[PDB]
DNA sequence: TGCACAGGATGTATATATCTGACACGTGCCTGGAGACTAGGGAGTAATCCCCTTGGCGGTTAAAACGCGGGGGACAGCGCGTACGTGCGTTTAAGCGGTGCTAGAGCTGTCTACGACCAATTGAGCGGCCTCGGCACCGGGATTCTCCAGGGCG
């Protein structure tokens, strides 16, 4: 979810981010895909919308 | 001699004159009915401001909700005996008729304290405020307080 687990976690596992709906994306939505892209990812991140 | 009868000698409901009690009707003096003047208390309005809502997403917590074991307490059954229920005779005392009283209950003038009604002052009491020492909540630790397992004892 956006507010619960889409804010501070470390997950490096997924290579893809999917967004069903985005209300605010100056910042708040940018954090969601940045939960995916991290230091431990050696693969390019493909982010859809 | 045993017996029926004709009339008196008592009862008894029956019908008549008589004694309370309560409804019904005819008054006149403290009530109501009503007319006019004053006026302040009630009906009506103009802001107002002020706390009280509008509508619904999520995240999380504390409180509400459900589920089972069983332990003890509600609860049915049943025997006992003494404690009132029921029935007599015997007594003390209230009900009631009647009486002599009085001392307190009950309606009415006097005036006189004495409280109702109305200006003038103010100060003690109410709106406003802003602090700190008592209060709210919880840790530390000692203390008590109940729960469960032998075992020494039946
Ligand atoms: Mg961080």
From Swiss-Prot:
Query: Additional comments on file?
Result: Present with 656 molecules/cell in log phase SD medium.
Family statement: Belongs to the SNF2/RAD54 helicase family. SWR1 subfamily.
Say what the protein does: Catalytic component of the SWR1 complex which mediates the ATP-dependent exchange of histone H2A for the H2A variant HZT1 leading to transcriptional regulation of selected genes by chromatin remodeling.
| Protein name as it appears in the record | Helicase SWR1
Cysteines joined through disulfide linkages = none
| Signal peptide start-end | none
Q: Where in the cell is it found?
A: Nucleus
**In which organism is this protein found?**
Saccharomyces cerevisiae (strain ATCC 204508 / S288c) (Baker's yeast)
Q: How does it assemble?
A: Component of the SWR1 chromatin-remodeling complex composed of at least ACT1, ARP4, RVB1, RVB2, ARP6, YAF9, VPS71, VPS72, SWC3, SWC4, SWC5, SWC7 and SWR1, and perhaps BDF1.
């Amino acid at each position: 979810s956006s507010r619960s687990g889409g804010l501070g976690i470390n997950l490096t596992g997924a290579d893809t981010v999917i967004f069903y709906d985005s209300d605010w994306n100056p910042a708040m939505d940018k954090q969601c895909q940045d939960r995916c892209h991290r230091i431990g990812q050696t693969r390019d991140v493909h982010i859809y919308r």
